[PDB]
Amino acid sequence: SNAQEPILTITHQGQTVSATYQELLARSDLTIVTETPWTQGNTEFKGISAQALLAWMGVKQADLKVIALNKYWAEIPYSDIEKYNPVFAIQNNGKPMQIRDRGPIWSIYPLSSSGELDNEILHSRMVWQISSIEIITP
Numbered sequence: 001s002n003a004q005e006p007i008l009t010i011t012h013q014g015q016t017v018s019a020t021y022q023e024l025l026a027r028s029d030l031t032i033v034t035e036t037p038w039t040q041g042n043t044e045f046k047g048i049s050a051q052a053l054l055a056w057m058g059v060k061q062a063d064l065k066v067i068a069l070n071k072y073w074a075e076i077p078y079s080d081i082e083k084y085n086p087v088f089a090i091q092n093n094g095k096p097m098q099i100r101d102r103g104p105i106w107s108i109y110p111l112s113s114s115g116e117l118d119n120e121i122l123h124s125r126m127v128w129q130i131s132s133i134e135i136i137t138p
């Protein structure tokens with residue numbers, strides 16, 4: 001693959017848009033440094049924040065339905081977007097993520113800085129190998 005191949009589809013109001021790594025990196029507004037239940041120590045995760053992705057799509061309040069390559073899925077509620085602003089990470093310590101290393105996109109919450117490292121609800125919303133995001137409006 002390469003930085004210009006599509007890796008994500010976003011659906012909003014019955015319309016689908018595709019995005020490449022190159023595109024997502026150009027819109028990457030947030031780095032989260034955090035521990036996770038599946039990694040050692042602190043990791044730096046850079047990508048497009050949930051708030052930034054909604055702004056791009058022309059929405060302020062919405063939930064996100066996130067689906068992974070392996071079919072796992074989880075909905076990120078607006079309340080989490082407001083309170084935690086999780087990042088759709090495309091880099092792990094500054095480099096792209098191979099599918100075999102939870103890539104190409106992984107939703108990451110600021111567990112360390114929010115004191116939520118043991119919060120299983122937030123863990124369940126940290127979806128690796130993301131392939132699609134659907135914006136769910138009220």
Ligand SMILES: Nc1nc2ncc([C@H](O)[C@H](O)CO)nc2c(=O)[nH]1
Nearest residue numbers: 068070072120123124126127128129
């Ligand atoms: N793609 C993908 N992402 C995941 N993210 C988090 C967790 C955690 O185990 C959750 O706590 C499970 O609900 N599981 C998964 C998973 O299986 N698949």
